[PDB]
Amino acid sequence: AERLPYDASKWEFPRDRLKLGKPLGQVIEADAFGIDKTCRTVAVKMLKTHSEHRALMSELKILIHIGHHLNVVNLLGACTKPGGPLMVITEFCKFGNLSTYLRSKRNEFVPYKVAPEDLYKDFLTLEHLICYSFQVAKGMEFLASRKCIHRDLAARNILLSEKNVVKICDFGPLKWMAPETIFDRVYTIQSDVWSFGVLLWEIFSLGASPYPGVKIDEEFCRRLKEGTRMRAPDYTTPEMYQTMLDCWHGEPSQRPTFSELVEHLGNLLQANAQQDRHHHHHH
């Protein structure tokens, strides 16, 4: 990270071209003038210690290194040179974190649509839910391909933009932690797959909190290690629940890879669409 370079000619943005807004270590909303090729709303992560400055600077280098992907919040620029505080600028996703958003659509859900469709205008459907899952998996496939390990994958770190496009971000969580992470402090791509399994449960429970009614203590961890798992959420399909179980396999090397998840979820998305075309056609 630190060894990574920072190409200022390409990424540097003038501090006076920004107008800081309300709060979203701190992430805040702001208006950028000329960030691309005009005033555009952006999100800014800045410090609120040399240690912390190095961390943020390294996050910036890594995002640059990783590159662009539709399902990863896009980096737009940064203010790193002397004269002001260090600021990392990204795209702004208007609908916000997926957990809160799904929570707000609980009275606006139908498994699929049929005529008259306006009965379900802006409703969420199985297609939406599988689609959000498919998107995040592609994003993680992209990051794991580059040896990146998120370490905090959860609904709260997924953002929703225009046209139902979701993006993986990091505002920086025992309930999202793999057994090896809790007990051996081991973080790997495979522990990220475990977390993804919890993310799936969050999406298919429409933003509910994981392990409902369970106290997170010594017994929680013990039983997790021994094989106990959350039960199927209210809006899941049998296949999506099995995928969740596949993601929570006790043996890290037996969990599916993100490439396998992208392939699998894509297949479920297509089967769901075909089913939907028949429901729509017959009624």
Ligand SMILES: CNC(=O)c1cc(Oc2ccc3oc(Nc4ccc(Cl)c(OC[C@@H]5CCCN5C)c4)nc3c2)ccn1
């Ligand atoms: C309503 N809309 C909003 O509220 C809203 C809030 C927003 O907030 C932000 C602001 C700046 C950000 O910068 C990052 N970094 C970041 C993103 C992805 C990865 Cl994989 C990463 O990786 C971090 C590093 C690299 C791999 C493992 N990690 C430890 C770091 N996420 C951010 C989120 C953005 C858009 N809308």
